[PDB]
Design a protein around this ligand. Structure first.
Ligand SMILES: C[C@H](CCC(=O)NCCC[N+](C)(C)CCCS(=O)(=O)[O-])[C@H]1CC[C@H]2[C@@H]3[C@H](O)C[C@@H]4C[C@H](O)CC[C@]4(C)[C@H]3C[C@H](O)[C@]12C
Ligand SMILES: C[C@H](CCC(=O)NCCC[N+](C)(C)CCCS(=O)(=O)[O-])[C@H]1CC[C@H]2[C@@H]3[C@H](O)C[C@@H]4C[C@H](O)CC[C@]4(C)[C@H]3C[C@H](O)[C@]12C
Ligand SMILES: C[C@H](CCC(=O)NCCC[N+](C)(C)CCCS(=O)(=O)[O-])[C@H]1CC[C@H]2[C@@H]3[C@H](O)C[C@@H]4C[C@H](O)CC[C@]4(C)[C@H]3C[C@H](O)[C@]12C
Ligand SMILES: C[C@H](CCC(=O)NCCC[N+](C)(C)CCCS(=O)(=O)[O-])[C@H]1CC[C@H]2[C@@H]3[C@H](O)C[C@@H]4C[C@H](O)CC[C@]4(C)[C@H]3C[C@H](O)[C@]12C
Ligand SMILES: C[C@H](CCC(=O)NCCC[N+](C)(C)CCCS(=O)(=O)[O-])[C@H]1CC[C@H]2[C@@H]3[C@H](O)C[C@@H]4C[C@H](O)CC[C@]4(C)[C@H]3C[C@H](O)[C@]12C
Ligand SMILES: Nc1ncnc2c1ncn2[C@@H]1O[C@H](CSCC[C@H](N)C(=O)O)[C@@H](O)[C@H]1O
Ligand SMILES: */O=C(\[O])[C@]1([C])[N][C](C([O])=O)[C]S1
Ligand code: SF4
Ligand SMILES: [Cl-]
Length: 346
């Protein structure tokens, strides 16, 4: 029964079977109660502040060939771009002028910048008195060390899928073992570390989703980014089914229940698959939003999946828009960098 699974979630009995059953029950009443539980846990542990992370997608060049991703190297039907270091720093400064307290630098795995150009950019942005998060993919330990010395605070490296077999199939350049080793290295070097997964990948099962939740709980990540798989027409997965929004939302809710003090974004992919999806997600366990700060004419070229929102508006619209969102949700913008504030418990 749903009521018993809720009770067990409330008492923190996070067994495999309780998670499977939560993910398998499709009853509306159960789902709504699960979302209310996550919302309430969010409020109690991380409060009403919604932390704004301004993301600059500074290059869409990638050396990898992930099957799901529109930036994969085999996609010849994409105009590739690279922002200059000066452009990146000045665009970051503009976001800080607009009130961002974290700058996220994201790219394809583009060798050009690595490691020294990144280091230089990080140092310049850190002078602005904000947190810096990197989301650059898999690189040697030495690169991660250089970036940490340069002042980077956080690193986002979604684990994608905790099924090693599925991982290697979808990400043929690498492996789950490699991805995990990167995540462990980042944690050792003192980054606030983010992981997370896609929901509704071709071949992914409900037991796989359970294993994603258990993986996340085991390593106690600071941030967890979850969104649905959205097929891209210039990829091998073009004809596969999109991930289900509701199931994805349940994954966010369960993540908050499992990791009550973590930082959990309402991802752009959630807002792409359903109009108003980020706002829903912020009411079902999430506490972070990542407005797109990539400038025109590049923004529209950073196409991991189609239909991405925030492309038609002026390139400074997103920060004001999320501030309006936060207000209409009855929430508050973050006052500090929004680092993880651990609540030690039993
Ligand atoms: C309470 C009012 C008025 C009902 C009436 O006409 N009086 C009705 C009219 C349209 C209804 C919503 C939509 O259906 C979309 C969605 C379907 C889900 O399944 C349940 C949630 C949700 C948000 C619905 C909730 C509620 O039910 C609404 C607000
Ligand atoms: C806004 C709609 C529809 C509400 C509605 O329209 N219900 C009828 C009117 C009720 N009023 C009290 C306004 C008047 C009553 C007198 S009347 O004469 O109208 O009958 C309600 C119906 C179900 C609600 C969600 C679920 O909970 C799950 C979840 C819990 C989290 O925590 C917050 C997020 C989320 C997604 C909820 C958001 C929102 O809250 C929803 C969509
Ligand atoms: C960038 C330009 C020119 C002046 C400038 O370069 N300003 C640097 C401000 C730096 N900070 C954000 C760190 C100040 C924090 C002050 S605070 O008292 O909010 O802590 C300034 C002038 C007016 C400012 C907007 C309005 O105000 C309304 C609104 C308030 C929100 O809040 C943040 C978003 C928004 C849209 C503002 C963004 C930005 O800022 C604007 C465009
Ligand atoms: C109206 C749109 C479909 C739009 C379209 O037509 N595309 C559908 C797609 C996903 C649906 C939500 C999710 O199920 C999660 C949640 C379940 C609760 O029970 C009721 C509330 C809530 C927020 C649902 C409301 C509504 O039903 C949504 C937004
Ligand atoms: C400039 C645009 C339009 C509007 C739309 C929503 C507005 C924000 C919200 O009202 C919440 C909040 C209230 C505080 O009072 C002042 C700060 C803040 C962040 C507002 C600043 C500004 O006014 C915003 C961005
Ligand atoms: N088709 C698609 N649908 C939904 N999310 C996708 C997607 N393609 C990629 N993503 C997400 O986009 C993220 C950013 S890729 C850029 C960061 C870095 N190269 C890296 O891979 O870590 C990936 O973590 C993945 O979860
Ligand atoms: O999960 C995240 O941190 C990011 C930044 N959100 C992006 C999206 O498109 O939803 C991809 S990773
Ligand atoms: S998911 Fe990241 S590493 Fe993989 S192809 Fe896309 S940009 Fe490159
Ligand atoms: Cl961050």
């Amino acid at each position: 029964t749903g009521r018993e699974i809720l009770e067990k979630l409330e008492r923190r009995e996070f067994t495999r079977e309780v998670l499977k059953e939560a993910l398998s029950i499709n009853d509306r009443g159960f789902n709504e109660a699960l979302f209310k539980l996550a919302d309430e846990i969010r409020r109690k542990y991380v409060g009403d502040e919604v932390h704004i992370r301004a993301i600059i997608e500074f290059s869409n060049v990638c050396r990898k060939n992930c099957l799901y991703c529109g930036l994969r190297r085999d996609n010849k039907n994409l105009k590739r771009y690279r922002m200059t270091p000066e452009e990146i720093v000045e665009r970051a400064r503009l976001a800080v002028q607009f009130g961002a307290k974290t700058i996220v630098l994201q790219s394809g795995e583009d060798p050009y910048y690595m490691p020294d150009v990144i280091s230089d950019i990080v140092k310049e942005i850190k002078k602005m008195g904000v947190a810096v998060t990197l989301s650059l993919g898999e690189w040697p330990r030495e690169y991660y060390e250089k970036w940490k010395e340069a002042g980077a605070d956080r690193y986002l490296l979604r684990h994608e899928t905790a099924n090693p077999v599925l991982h290697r199939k979808l990400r043929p350049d690498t492996s789950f073992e490699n991805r995990l080793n990167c995540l462990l290295t980042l944690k050792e070097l003192g980054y606030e570390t983010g992981a997370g997964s896609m929901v509704g990948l071709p071949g992914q099962t409900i037991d796989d989703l359970v294993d994603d939740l258990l993986f996340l709980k085991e390593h106690d990540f600071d941030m967890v980014g979850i969104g649905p798989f959205i097929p891209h027409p210039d990829t091998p997965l073009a004809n596969e089914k999109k991930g289900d929004f509701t199931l994805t939302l349940k994954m966010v809710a369960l993540t908050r229940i499992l990791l009550p003090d973590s930082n959990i974004p309402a991802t752009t992919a959630m807002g792409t698959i359903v109009p108003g999806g980020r706002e829903i997600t912020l009411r079902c366990g999430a506490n972070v939003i990542m407005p797109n700060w990539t400038p025109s004419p590049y923004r529209q070229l950073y196409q991991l999946y189609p239909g991405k929102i925030s492309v038609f508006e002026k390139d400074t619209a997103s920060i004001p828009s999320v501030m309006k969102m936060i207000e209409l949700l009855g929430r508050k913008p973050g006052r500090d960098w929004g680092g993880r504030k651990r609540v030690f418990e039993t």
